[PDB]
Chains A and B, each alone.
Chain A
Amino acid sequence: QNPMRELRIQKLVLNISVGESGDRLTRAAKVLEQLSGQTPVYSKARYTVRQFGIRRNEKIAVHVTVRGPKAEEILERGLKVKEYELRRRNFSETGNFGFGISEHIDLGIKYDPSIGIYGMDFYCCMTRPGERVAKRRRCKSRIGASHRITREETIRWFKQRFDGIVR
Protein backbone atom coordinates (compact mmCIF):
# COMPACT_ATOMS: atom_id res chain seq x y z
CA GLN A 1 0.00 0.00 0.00
CA ASN A 2 1.26 3.46 -0.99
CA PRO A 3 -1.49 6.03 -1.70
CA MET A 4 0.14 9.23 -0.42
CA ARG A 5 3.65 8.20 0.65
CA GLU A 6 5.61 9.20 -2.46
CA LEU A 7 8.88 11.07 -1.99
CA ARG A 8 9.63 14.46 -3.53
CA ILE A 9 12.06 17.37 -3.29
CA GLN A 10 10.98 19.76 -0.54
CA LYS A 11 13.66 22.37 -1.26
CA LEU A 12 17.29 22.74 -2.30
CA VAL A 13 19.53 25.21 -0.47
CA LEU A 14 23.11 25.91 -1.51
CA ASN A 15 25.72 28.19 0.03
CA ILE A 16 29.21 29.60 -0.45
CA SER A 17 31.47 30.24 2.55
CA VAL A 18 34.04 32.79 1.38
CA GLY A 19 35.27 33.15 4.96
CA GLU A 20 36.21 36.85 4.91
CA SER A 21 34.28 40.07 4.37
CA GLY A 22 34.91 42.66 1.69
CA ASP A 23 34.56 43.12 -2.05
CA ARG A 24 35.43 39.46 -2.60
CA LEU A 25 32.23 38.37 -0.84
CA THR A 26 30.16 40.81 -2.90
CA ARG A 27 31.47 39.19 -6.08
CA ALA A 28 30.53 35.77 -4.71
CA ALA A 29 26.97 36.96 -4.05
CA LYS A 30 27.00 38.43 -7.56
CA VAL A 31 27.82 34.98 -8.96
CA LEU A 32 25.04 33.19 -7.10
CA GLU A 33 22.20 35.40 -8.37
CA GLN A 34 22.21 34.22 -12.00
CA LEU A 35 22.45 30.56 -10.99
CA SER A 36 19.04 30.70 -9.28
CA GLY A 37 17.47 33.94 -10.49
CA GLN A 38 16.70 35.14 -6.95
CA THR A 39 18.42 37.65 -4.71
CA PRO A 40 20.58 35.90 -2.09
CA VAL A 41 20.83 36.53 1.65
CA TYR A 42 23.98 37.22 3.67
CA SER A 43 25.12 35.59 6.90
CA LYS A 44 27.00 36.92 9.92
CA ALA A 45 29.83 35.39 11.94
CA ARG A 46 28.44 34.36 15.32
CA TYR A 47 31.79 33.32 16.84
CA THR A 48 34.95 35.42 17.20
CA VAL A 49 38.16 33.47 16.56
CA ARG A 50 41.66 34.79 15.88
CA GLN A 51 42.93 31.66 14.09
CA PHE A 52 40.44 32.18 11.25
CA GLY A 53 40.71 35.98 11.52
CA ILE A 54 36.98 36.63 11.96
CA ARG A 55 35.04 38.58 14.58
CA ARG A 56 31.41 38.93 15.59
CA ASN A 57 28.82 40.61 13.36
CA GLU A 58 30.86 40.46 10.15
CA LYS A 59 29.52 38.91 6.96
CA ILE A 60 31.44 35.79 5.91
CA ALA A 61 29.03 33.74 3.76
CA VAL A 62 26.02 33.83 1.45
CA HIS A 63 23.26 31.37 0.63
CA VAL A 64 19.94 31.06 -1.19
CA THR A 65 17.11 28.52 -1.42
CA VAL A 66 14.99 27.33 -4.34
CA ARG A 67 11.86 25.21 -4.63
CA GLY A 68 9.82 23.37 -7.22
CA PRO A 69 10.87 22.62 -10.80
CA LYS A 70 13.72 25.15 -10.61
CA ALA A 71 15.32 23.10 -7.84
CA GLU A 72 14.83 19.98 -9.95
CA GLU A 73 16.76 21.48 -12.87
CA ILE A 74 19.64 22.92 -10.84
CA LEU A 75 20.10 19.62 -8.99
CA GLU A 76 20.50 17.84 -12.34
CA ARG A 77 23.39 20.11 -13.35
CA GLY A 78 25.27 19.40 -10.13
CA LEU A 79 24.96 15.63 -10.46
CA LYS A 80 26.32 15.87 -14.01
CA VAL A 81 29.66 17.13 -12.67
CA LYS A 82 29.61 14.38 -10.05
CA GLU A 83 28.71 12.00 -12.94
CA TYR A 84 26.02 10.47 -10.70
CA GLU A 85 28.37 8.85 -8.19
CA LEU A 86 27.98 9.57 -4.48
CA ARG A 87 29.47 7.92 -1.41
CA ARG A 88 27.22 5.99 0.97
CA ARG A 89 28.16 8.29 3.86
CA ASN A 90 26.57 11.28 2.08
CA PHE A 91 23.09 10.30 3.32
CA SER A 92 22.05 11.24 6.85
CA GLU A 93 19.86 9.27 9.24
CA THR A 94 16.95 11.59 8.47
CA GLY A 95 17.03 10.91 4.74
CA ASN A 96 18.79 13.92 3.22
CA PHE A 97 21.93 14.21 1.12
CA GLY A 98 24.35 16.78 -0.24
CA PHE A 99 27.68 17.29 -1.96
CA GLY A 100 30.11 19.98 -3.07
CA ILE A 101 32.01 21.07 -6.16
CA SER A 102 35.43 22.71 -6.30
CA GLU A 103 34.86 24.73 -9.48
CA HIS A 104 31.74 26.80 -10.11
CA ILE A 105 32.35 27.26 -13.85
CA ASP A 106 32.55 23.53 -14.60
CA LEU A 107 28.94 24.02 -15.62
CA GLY A 108 28.64 27.04 -17.88
CA ILE A 109 27.98 30.58 -16.65
CA LYS A 110 30.11 32.11 -19.44
CA TYR A 111 33.14 32.67 -17.21
CA ASP A 112 34.26 36.26 -16.65
CA PRO A 113 37.78 37.02 -15.35
CA SER A 114 36.49 39.85 -13.15
CA ILE A 115 34.25 37.77 -10.87
CA GLY A 116 36.81 35.04 -10.20
CA ILE A 117 36.52 31.42 -9.12
CA TYR A 118 34.45 30.08 -6.22
CA GLY A 119 33.58 26.71 -4.70
CA MET A 120 29.95 25.94 -3.96
CA ASP A 121 28.09 23.56 -1.64
CA PHE A 122 24.91 21.61 -2.41
CA TYR A 123 22.19 20.28 -0.11
CA CYS A 124 18.56 19.25 -0.63
CA CYS A 125 15.71 18.16 1.64
CA MET A 126 13.37 15.22 1.07
CA THR A 127 9.77 15.11 2.26
CA ARG A 128 6.38 13.40 1.96
CA PRO A 129 3.00 14.99 1.20
CA GLY A 130 1.02 16.34 4.12
CA GLU A 131 3.95 17.55 6.22
CA ARG A 132 2.28 20.91 6.88
CA VAL A 133 1.00 19.40 10.14
CA ALA A 134 4.30 20.18 11.86
CA LYS A 135 4.58 23.74 10.49
CA ARG A 136 1.11 25.32 10.53
CA ARG A 137 0.72 27.99 13.20
CA ARG A 138 -2.59 26.74 14.61
CA CYS A 139 -2.84 23.27 16.18
CA LYS A 140 0.77 22.38 15.41
CA SER A 141 1.64 18.74 16.09
CA ARG A 142 4.23 16.04 15.39
CA ILE A 143 4.23 13.60 12.47
CA GLY A 144 3.97 9.87 13.04
CA ALA A 145 6.69 7.25 13.17
CA SER A 146 5.54 5.40 10.04
CA HIS A 147 5.41 8.60 7.95
CA ARG A 148 9.07 9.65 8.25
CA ILE A 149 11.87 8.92 5.80
CA THR A 150 14.75 6.56 6.59
CA ARG A 151 18.27 6.39 5.19
CA GLU A 152 17.65 3.28 3.07
CA GLU A 153 14.57 4.71 1.37
CA THR A 154 16.21 7.86 0.02
CA ILE A 155 19.18 6.08 -1.58
CA ARG A 156 16.78 3.70 -3.33
CA TRP A 157 14.93 6.73 -4.70
CA PHE A 158 18.19 8.28 -5.91
CA LYS A 159 19.40 5.17 -7.76
CA GLN A 160 16.03 4.57 -9.40
CA ARG A 161 15.57 8.17 -10.59
CA PHE A 162 19.02 9.25 -11.81
CA ASP A 163 20.38 5.73 -12.51
CA GLY A 164 23.36 6.70 -10.36
CA ILE A 165 25.60 4.56 -8.19
CA VAL A 166 26.68 4.63 -4.55
CA ARG A 167 30.15 3.74 -3.29
Chain B
Amino acid sequence: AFSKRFEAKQQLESYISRVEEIISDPTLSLKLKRGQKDKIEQALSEAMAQLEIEDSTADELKKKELALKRLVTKAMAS
Protein backbone atom coordinates (compact mmCIF):
# COMPACT_ATOMS: atom_id res chain seq x y z
CA ALA B 1 0.00 0.00 0.00
CA PHE B 2 2.86 2.36 0.82
CA SER B 3 4.55 1.75 -2.53
CA LYS B 4 1.37 1.49 -4.62
CA ARG B 5 -0.10 4.76 -3.37
CA PHE B 6 3.24 6.57 -3.69
CA GLU B 7 3.63 5.56 -7.35
CA ALA B 8 0.27 7.04 -8.35
CA LYS B 9 1.00 10.28 -6.48
CA GLN B 10 3.97 11.09 -8.72
CA GLN B 11 2.12 10.35 -11.97
CA LEU B 12 -0.74 12.67 -11.03
CA GLU B 13 1.74 15.45 -10.26
CA SER B 14 3.53 14.89 -13.58
CA TYR B 15 0.40 15.40 -15.69
CA ILE B 16 -0.69 18.54 -13.81
CA SER B 17 2.67 20.14 -14.57
CA ARG B 18 2.43 18.72 -18.09
CA VAL B 19 -0.91 20.36 -18.92
CA GLU B 20 0.28 23.75 -17.62
CA GLU B 21 2.53 24.05 -20.68
CA ILE B 22 -0.41 23.72 -23.09
CA ILE B 23 -2.54 26.34 -21.32
CA SER B 24 0.41 28.75 -20.93
CA ASP B 25 1.74 28.95 -24.49
CA PRO B 26 -0.01 31.49 -26.76
CA THR B 27 0.07 29.36 -29.91
CA LEU B 28 -2.31 26.66 -28.67
CA SER B 29 -4.49 29.00 -26.61
CA LEU B 30 -5.07 31.26 -29.63
CA LYS B 31 -7.57 28.93 -31.33
CA LEU B 32 -9.08 27.42 -28.15
CA LYS B 33 -12.21 29.03 -26.71
CA ARG B 34 -12.71 30.34 -23.18
CA GLY B 35 -15.52 27.92 -22.38
CA GLN B 36 -13.08 25.04 -22.65
CA LYS B 37 -10.35 27.00 -20.82
CA ASP B 38 -12.22 27.73 -17.59
CA LYS B 39 -13.48 24.14 -17.33
CA ILE B 40 -9.92 22.78 -17.23
CA GLU B 41 -8.82 25.20 -14.51
CA GLN B 42 -11.98 24.42 -12.52
CA ALA B 43 -11.04 20.73 -12.60
CA LEU B 44 -7.46 21.62 -11.62
CA SER B 45 -8.67 23.37 -8.45
CA GLU B 46 -9.91 20.25 -6.65
CA ALA B 47 -6.93 18.28 -7.98
CA MET B 48 -4.63 20.48 -5.88
CA ALA B 49 -6.68 19.78 -2.75
CA GLN B 50 -6.47 15.98 -2.61
CA LEU B 51 -2.67 15.97 -2.72
CA GLU B 52 -2.74 17.87 0.58
CA ILE B 53 -5.20 15.39 2.10
CA GLU B 54 -3.84 12.04 3.30
CA ASP B 55 -6.89 9.76 2.99
CA SER B 56 -6.62 9.55 -0.81
CA THR B 57 -5.84 6.04 -2.07
CA ALA B 58 -4.66 4.60 -5.37
CA ASP B 59 -8.19 4.28 -6.75
CA GLU B 60 -9.20 7.91 -6.17
CA LEU B 61 -5.93 9.37 -7.46
CA LYS B 62 -5.90 7.14 -10.55
CA LYS B 63 -9.51 7.98 -11.46
CA LYS B 64 -8.88 11.73 -11.73
CA GLU B 65 -5.73 11.12 -13.78
CA LEU B 66 -7.84 9.89 -16.70
CA ALA B 67 -10.69 12.30 -15.92
CA LEU B 68 -8.38 15.30 -16.29
CA LYS B 69 -6.75 13.81 -19.40
CA ARG B 70 -10.12 13.00 -20.98
CA LEU B 71 -11.38 16.55 -20.44
CA VAL B 72 -8.36 18.33 -21.93
CA THR B 73 -7.93 15.95 -24.87
CA LYS B 74 -11.47 16.63 -26.12
CA ALA B 75 -10.82 20.36 -26.49
CA MET B 76 -7.51 20.07 -28.35
CA ALA B 77 -8.64 17.30 -30.70
CA SER B 78 -11.71 19.21 -31.92
Are A and B direct contacts in the complex by CB distance below 8 Å? yes
List residues of A whose CB falls within 8 A of some B CB: 47-48, 56
What are some 4 contacts across the A-B interface (CB < 8 A)? Answer: A47-B34, A48-B38, A48-B41, A56-B38
The CA of A47 and the CA of B38, in the complex, are separated in Å by 8
Count of B residues near A, CB < 8 Å? 3
Closest to A55 in B: B41
- Residues on A with C-beta less than 8 A from B38 are 48, 56
Specify which chain B residues have a CB less than 8 angstroms from the CB of A56 in the assembled complex: 38
Q: Would you give the shortest CB distance from B47 to chain A, in whole angstroms?
A: 16
Return the chain A residue nearest B42 by Cβ: A56
In the assembly, what is the distance between CA of A47 and CA of B41, in Å? 11
Q: Which residues of B contact A47 (CB under 8 A)?
A: 34
Closest Cβ of chain A to B64, distance in Å, is 21
- A-B pairs, top 4 by smallest CB distance, nearest first, are A48-B41, A48-B38, A56-B38, A47-B34
Complex-state Cα separation, A47 to B33, whole angstroms: 12
8 A Cβ contacts from B24-51 to A: 34, 38, 41
